[PDB]
Amino acid sequence: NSFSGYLKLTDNVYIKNADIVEEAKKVKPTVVVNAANVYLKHGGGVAGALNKATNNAMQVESDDYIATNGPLKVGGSCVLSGHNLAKHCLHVVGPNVNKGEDIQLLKSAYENFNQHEVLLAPLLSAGIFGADPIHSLRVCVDTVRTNVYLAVFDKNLYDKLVSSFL
Ligand SMILES: O=C(O)C1=C(c2ccc3cccnc3c2)CCC1
User: Which among 8, 10, 37, 142 is most buried, taking Cβ atoms within 10 Å?
Assistant: First the structure.
């Protein structure tokens, strides 16, 4: 199957009201982005959902990556297997502004997307990371230069983002 049902916001940013796990299972994209933390502990939010859909195979692989490589930096990324969801999973760490991490690092986090021509992704630093999701979409539009297909689960949030960008 291929991406379908997206609204084009800019030349390269698309958005859909969808569960990213279901999108990944339908499309099997080359790259799905995870909203990760520095130790790749996929406990909740989008990370918990993607790891559960791999039946914990992502967590076991992530623990081995950390033991061998050490933690990521805030604003950084690594490429690991996508298992049943994608060819690859790009684990990206946005700042957790509720813990005083600098919002400037949200631009650095989105810069990692430019290494891939096409990605399925969530908004970074939204949810438990504490950033305003509309601000995160603005940074995505201002920073990502490759084609990104954004999945937003919550309908109320999705409608607010589309109203702000149209
Ligand atoms: O897209 C959303 O509505 C947002 C979040 C979320 C959280 C958990 C999810 C689990 C499965 C699939 N999608 C998810 C999405 C947290 C911030 C905004």
Answer: 37
Q: Is 126 in the pocket of ligand 1 (CB under 6 A)?
A: yes
**Resolution of the PDB structure in angstroms:** 1.2
Task: Name the 3-class secondary structure at 133.
Answer: helix
State the structure-solving technique: X-ray
Alpha helices, DSSP H, located in 19-115: 20-27, 45-53, 57-69, 105-111
Structural domain 1-165, CATH architecture: 3-Layer(aba) Sandwich (3.40)
Mutate to test the pocket of ligand 1, among 32, 153, 160 (most ligand atoms within 8 A of CB): 153
Mutation probe of ligand 1 site: the residue of 23, 32, 154, 155 with most atoms within 8 A of C-beta: 154
Domain boundaries, the chain: 1-165
What does the alpha-carbon distance between residue 118 and residue 152 come to, in Å, rounded to a whole number?
17
Calpha distance 122→64 (Å, rounded): 24
Q: Are 119 and 32 in contact (CB under 8 A)?
A: yes
Q: Where are the beta strands (DSSP E) in the chain?
A: 7-8, 13-17, 31-35, 77-81, 88-92, 118-121, 147-152
